Design a protein around this ligand. Structure first.
Ligand SMILES: Nc1nc2c(ncn2[C@@H]2O[C@H](COP(=O)(O)OP(=O)(O)OP(O)(O)=S)[C@@H](O)[C@H]2O)c(=O)[nH]1
Ligand SMILES: CC(=O)/N=c1/[nH]c(C)c(-c2ccc(Cl)c(S(=O)(=O)NCCO)c2)s1
Ligand SMILES: CC(=O)/N=c1/[nH]c(C)c(-c2ccc(Cl)c(S(=O)(=O)NCCO)c2)s1
Ligand SMILES: CC(=O)/N=c1/[nH]c(C)c(-c2ccc(Cl)c(S(=O)(=O)NCCO)c2)s1
Lengths: 41, 470, 173, 470, 32, 470, 32, 41
């Protein structure tokens, strides 16, 4: 049913956007305490 | 023909028009409403200009194209209207650009007047103290009188007018911050219609210069008496805060919500009290605010008085057996209940006594609407506030709760009108208050549309008891 | 081992101009046509010598996407240099360089070294920004100027080496 | 750098370029290939112009914008190129419009020359018989010589040239239909480069007029000898069918496929024979075809001869012990195998002797490519055809099957090149041949990529035996 | 819009999700 | 009836069956093929059991239910078959569970035999050195002879048989790692059919015990001569590596691919050489491998010899003018070309001399297929290898490139069969080799189906030159 | 485009399908 | 799994588009023989 499909899709992107924000909030804390961690070797 | 029946009925108001414009995906409906906009009163439509323009920018071309001709029509009969369109179009895009340039295709006096005001504010960043800033401001404002009077006005004014003079000595800067806002007073001559009149003639000028803490009407007297133009019956005094580096779009959104709730509370018959203060968005970076006069922050009221809030009430109005006091108490209680509801419904955060004003009659007024809705403390009822209300067993305190319930009951009945305002603004918005995916869903839940009154009573109690814990 | 200096430099510009590949070219001599959006910030490092001193450069690849522009500005803090990049073959990207410099006179040291970079010089036939117009604008705004191709590697080392050198003699006294 | 390695290798040809342009969603790739188009030979790219332009129209702006500059570059150096672009852009849209107008921003002589040719054909609708039509055509064509020579040419020509003269008496109309096509012969003077030369000078003119069935070289003689310009070494004769009311886009697609299969069969070393005939799309409604000369329909070969096909072979080439016959038989067999494969692969329908031509050397040529692929009888091998092959136990017939297998084996190895052509054309196409959802899927299955040779042998047998049942 | 454009929209959204999950796992492993 | 025509033709093989089973969403097709499985030879279907079972587990119930009855049918006529089913079903789920239990509903001797072998390996973790481990292994293995002979077998064996005896003194542990694998030799008596025969009788037993580096046939002699059962013609010797804590599913997938490429190269006539080594998956954690005998790692060949690879060739086969050497060189060249192709096509990583075996005849064999496909160094051609080939200007080296091209040309013609294997395994797989979204797409690109031979020649050159840079 | 616009595109396609099925059933009943 | 969901949706619209065409082919036949049937009463 399309209403259920749409709801599944809306829910998946809500989660993704939340998760990106959760991550950026974690990353900013590292950036302001120990950025050495973030080195690309 | 049942839908067209509705649209041709008296029911049809600007709100309903906008709702269907926003929700219907039928191009014939969109076009039909685009046509019927012309049929409404200017005043009523004016209030929703940001919505219309937001929709134009961020929605289907179909939707834009239905709205445009009306806007063009308004723009042709009022340059004030044109100005706000141009300002808003620019501010709400960072589609829009092509039309802005077409409206701006004259207005140079006003645009340059505003650019200069903006420019002034940006310079003050290099002066680290309030006093130094104020001195540069006062000097630099005096130079603008050199260009007055002209084809220039303050869109934040209740009426049509020409600006004639700036009492620069009276202007003041508000804080020591990097992009500090500054308050000014402006002299104007009222019109019946701006577009077809005057630009009045310069009067070259010649105590009124000294600035001190005094009431608004005593300050009008002093400035008027010193002014070349002060003798005229045509003459009036305005005021604006100029924010050169602060975004005001959240602030504008809040204004509309406050104004709607105000009308809702007037229409139902709940004597809650709040004060929407006018906003003018100039860019995504900058704008102006019409301040409330005869009002100062709670925090500084306690630092200049050195008194407790109640003691200040008693000093400034009289003993609690006097009229002046009982009336002020009532205004306190009615303004508190109002603003509590607003804080809860909008999830207003960053609440402290720097953000709450007290006026001459005892109304409070909340002000800094950064941090609302989804944006990442809440409204508080300190015992100092409860004391002014006469305490927990007070009649007036019981009545405070009574008002809260009544105003909530009222809100629920007109929920759509409130939600509409926010929901349309969210469209192509990148603003912190819409950071969530569930901003509107959370907002609707907060009306508790399923509840019976008894349930709401309990919610009000929870809310109040929550406001006291800290 | 030991460096005499540690220079913090940021890469900024519109999304898609080639920042991550300038960096991948410069730091590990690698490039790719397929591209992975830079999320927030990426970190990479390399050492050079100028005027007899070993200078370690710390490069912060910021991301042109606006979604992340609240938290990139956190990194503008105390950066000694900024490579402001545009795509030679997409005119709009040159047009937005004006908003990208205001972005430094709000969130970054007002005495920072800036080089303007026209990237994708390998796309000769699709050029939408003439070398002359850009270099004119460059010094009208007090910026140093160069054209690069991360793809064929033209001027990539040079570009860095210029701005790091330029920086190394601003700092003194 | 492994992908960029590929793109910088010799492997990189226009096909691969187009494939990745079509498939990669990476804008950096699209742009890189957009740049590398300049690096290819004009001739090779020319062949794919319809694909590029189709993509431009119906695909992502990204994709369009990568292709454009190259096209602009070509358009600037050849007005022929410009013309085809303009014609195709218009034909493949009923985005495109803005660029067409920019290319057309001169070409008036050619555009009006073509408009007139088109206009002529449309008038013939009112004349219900072939003969009446031909008479009006002949008269009306004579009027066009009054405008020659000019800056005008036939895009269907192998070379650069100027058109000088139309031998109107030789032109003929092909059927009694409502929007009948008509064939004309045209005289031209060869160039080394059109864009920078001449427009040669008029020669006012003065048996050569009489028209009858004769070979091509005998008809060149007659027209040349009668012509003012016929003496020149510079002089050549061309021919086109003009279709005023017929869509040619299917026909164009078929051409490309035929041309590709031809190259595939040359590159592998299978001596199958087919004849792609040039197509010029002028609108979604109209276009031109370069006809095969010294060739007439099987059906009318049997109505004017009154003979059996074989008997006709024997009359026109000699006894089956002569060279001329054995060579013609071979051309028959090689052209049959070729066209069988094409009919099967393209699912060519509406196959009858009105749609099959026979040339002077014994090759057959199929022609009416309405009804192909998904569009809603198939290729047939009548015993009259099998007779010309020498019968079921003939060596040449066994060899026919041998060729079919070999040509299929070859096709499978280059499948991508074929599919690419069709798949890209399908994009924003409303054409009957793409009516299905599974046009391309069905096409791929028909290559039978899983099969071993022994399996293909069996498929060929099934195919042949299928072709004989009716 | 056409099915080809719908499919392309969905494929692009998935590619981004999978990339983002990997970007995150690469950050998390470092913290670990 | 055109599809059903195909399915009823000789064309129809297990591959095609599985393809359509996997791709058609038509339930009538699924069921029709489910029925036609019964019609195939057991041997041919056996090879694809993992695919079928994977599909059963991870696909539509429709698909599972079409496959099941056939599987049940096989399971009833062979307990070996049942076993592999039970093992695979369990391994490919961490739907499956209900059927596993139904098949296991007898097999206890085998399951406990395997559990004990597994249990042994796990205990060795506490012994930090190879030598200590081997000593405990040898002792603990001796105890298992106390339960032989029984209804037990090695599924990795080419034939039906009963296990009779374990020459424990000959078993050895391979490394010092935490979950070390260990190699054992096993004695068996061949059957014509297992399900209906024997369990032969115990022979209680009584130099053959000493273990040293010697060829396989010299080791068969020693063990046979010492064995109670060694006199019988019925007697044969097997070997397996037991991996108690390592996943083998990647390893199983690789096996199938190798086996397919081998058949492809036999079918076309390219004498490349590779060695698929049998895999038995027992859990997602554990399994067994049939090792290649008379073969040792390149790395240890250089550490025990102290020689250069070539010098070792010359010592062990003779001077390069001898037959033995020229034959070994050829096997080297043919096994290298093979394995290069495999490494490229599968993107095999972690390539070093610990992962490359050398056999007694000069073939190399690659082994550790962790790190393949999408999983996150490549195949290398060191100058030491090039030396054994006789150098860059050598005939045999030119021929190495010739073979690579030929084997690639062959692969391209049978691409579907290879891709099918991988594509179906990817289904509900969480394996590191499928970490990407574009595993299959990348795999297809690596066949370069668009290329002409000349293009492939260039790709081979690039590949080779790439293999030498390091 | 946004997921709201995608959902709206799909809802619109279904509304048409359901309408078309009813249009057809109304034709079929007449023939019956 | 999203690939399986996408495949389910593509299959459902293929059927719908087929069915619409099946219907239009029936309708065209009525339109060319007895259009009176199609009267709006
Ligand atoms: N031709 C050419 N292409 C380039 C060059 N530099 C980058 N590109 C291509 O541009 C595309 C985008 O580059 P990318 O590395 O994402 O830049 P970016 O600025 O980091 O983009 P983002 O990280 O803010 S999403 C890629 O396909 C890349 O291959 C260049 O010098 N020449
Ligand atoms: C005396 C006095 O404070 N008059 C005012 N009236 C109003 C509406 C004032 C106001 C309202 C909102 C805001 Cl946002 C500001 S403000 O100048 O920008 N203060 C920032 C943090 O306080 C000032 S201030
Ligand atoms: C003598 C003769 O027939 N020369 C021709 N050469 C070619 C390529 C011819 C041709 C090819 C294709 C088509 Cl489509 C046509 S046509 O004029 O349009 N015939 C329509 C049905 O036959 C004519 S006709
Ligand atoms: C003497 C000898 O090495 N015989 C073997 N034959 C085979 C196929 C061997 C083999 C093949 C694959 C693997 Cl994966 C192993 S292994 O025991 O598990 N080695 C792990 C890293 O080497 C061993 S080992």
């Amino acid at each position: 049913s399309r209403d259920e499909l749409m709801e599944a899709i809306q829910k998946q992107e809500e989660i993704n956007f939340r998760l990106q924000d959760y991550i950026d909030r974690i990353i900013v804390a590292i950036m302001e305490t120990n950025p050495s961690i973030l080195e690309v070797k | 023909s049942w839908l067209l029946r509705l649209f041709e009925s008296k029911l049809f108001d600007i709100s309903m028009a906008i709702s269907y414009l926003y929700n219907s995906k039928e191009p014939g409906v969109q076009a039909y409403i685009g046509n019927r906009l012309f049929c409404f009163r200017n005043e009523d439509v004016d209030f929703y200009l940001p919505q219309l323009l937001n929709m134009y920018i961020h929605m289907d071309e179909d939707v834009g194209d239905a709205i445009k001709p009306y806007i063009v029509h308004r723009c042709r009969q009022s340059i004030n209207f044109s100005l706000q369109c141009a300002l808003l179009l620019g501010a709400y895009s960072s589609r829009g650009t092509k039309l802005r340039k077409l409206i701006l295709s004259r207005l140079a006096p006003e645009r340059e007047f505003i650019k200069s005001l903006m420019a002034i504010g940006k310079r003050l960043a290099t002066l680290p103290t309030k006093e130094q800033k104020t001195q540069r401001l006062i000097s630099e404002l005096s130079l603008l009188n050199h260009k007055l009077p002209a084809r220039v006005w303050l869109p934040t004014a209740g009426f049509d007018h020409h600006v004639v003079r700036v009492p620069h000595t009276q202007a003041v800067v508000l804080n020591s911050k990097d992009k500090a806002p500054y308050l000014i007073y402006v002299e104007v001559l009222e019109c019946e219609n701006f577009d077809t009149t005057s630009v009045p003639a310069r009067i070259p000028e010649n105590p009124s210069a000294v600035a001190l803490k005094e009431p608004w009407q005593e300050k009008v007297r002093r400035i008027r008496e010193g002014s070349p133009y002060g003798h005229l019956p045509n003459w009036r005094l305005l005021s604006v805060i100029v924010k050169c580096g602060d975004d005001l779009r959240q602030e504008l959104l809040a204004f509309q919500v406050l104004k709607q709730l105000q009308s809702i509370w007037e229409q139902e018959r709940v004597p809650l009290w709040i004060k929407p203060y006018k906003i003018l968005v100039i860019s995504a970076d900058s704008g102006m605010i019409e301040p409330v006069v005869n009002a100062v922050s709670i925090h500084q009221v306690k630092k200049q008085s050195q008194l407790s809030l109640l003691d200040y009430f008693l000093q400034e109005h009289g003993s609690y057996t006097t009229e002046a006091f009982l009336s002020a108490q009532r205004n306190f209680v009615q303004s508190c209940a109002g603003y509590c509801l607003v804080c809860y419904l909008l999830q207003v955060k960053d609440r402290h006594n720097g953000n709450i004003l007290l006026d001459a009659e005892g109304h409070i007024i909340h002000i800094d609407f950064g941090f609302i809705l989804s944006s990442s403390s809440a409204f508080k009822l300190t015992t100092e506030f409860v004391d002014v209300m006469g305490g927990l067993d007070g009649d007036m305190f019981n009545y405070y709760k009574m008002l809260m319930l009544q105003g909530l009951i009222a809100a629920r009945k007109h929920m759509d009108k409130v939600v509409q305002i926010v929901e349309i603004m969210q469209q192509g918005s990148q603003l912190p208050c819409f950071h969530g995916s569930s901003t509107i869903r959370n907002l609707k839940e907060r009306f508790h549309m399923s509840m019976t009154e008894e349930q709401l009573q309990l919610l009000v109690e929870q809310m109040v008891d929550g406001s006291m814990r800290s | 081992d030991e460096y005499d200096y540690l220079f913090k430099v940021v890469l900024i510009g519109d999304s898609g101009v080639g920042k991550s590949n300038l960096l991948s070219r410069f730091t590990r001599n690698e490039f790719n046509l397929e591209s992975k959006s830079t999320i927030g910030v990426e970190f990479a490092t390399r050492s050079i010598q100028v005027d007899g001193k070993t200078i370690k450069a710390q490069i912060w690849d910021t991301a042109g996407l606006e979604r992340y522009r609240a938290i990139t500005s956190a990194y503008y803090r105390g950066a000694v240099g900024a490579l402001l990049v545009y795509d030679i073959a997409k005119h709009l990207t040159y047009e937005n360089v004006e908003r990208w410099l205001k972005e430094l006179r709000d969130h970054a040291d007002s005495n920072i070294v800036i080089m303007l970079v026209g990237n994708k010089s390998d796309l000769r036939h699709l050029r939408a920004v003439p070398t002359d117009e850009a270099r004119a604008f460059a010094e009208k705004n007090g910026l140093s100027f160069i054209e690069t191709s991360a793809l064929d590697s033209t001027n990539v080392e040079a570009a860095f080496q210029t701005i790091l050198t330029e920086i190394y003699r601003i700092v003194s006294q």
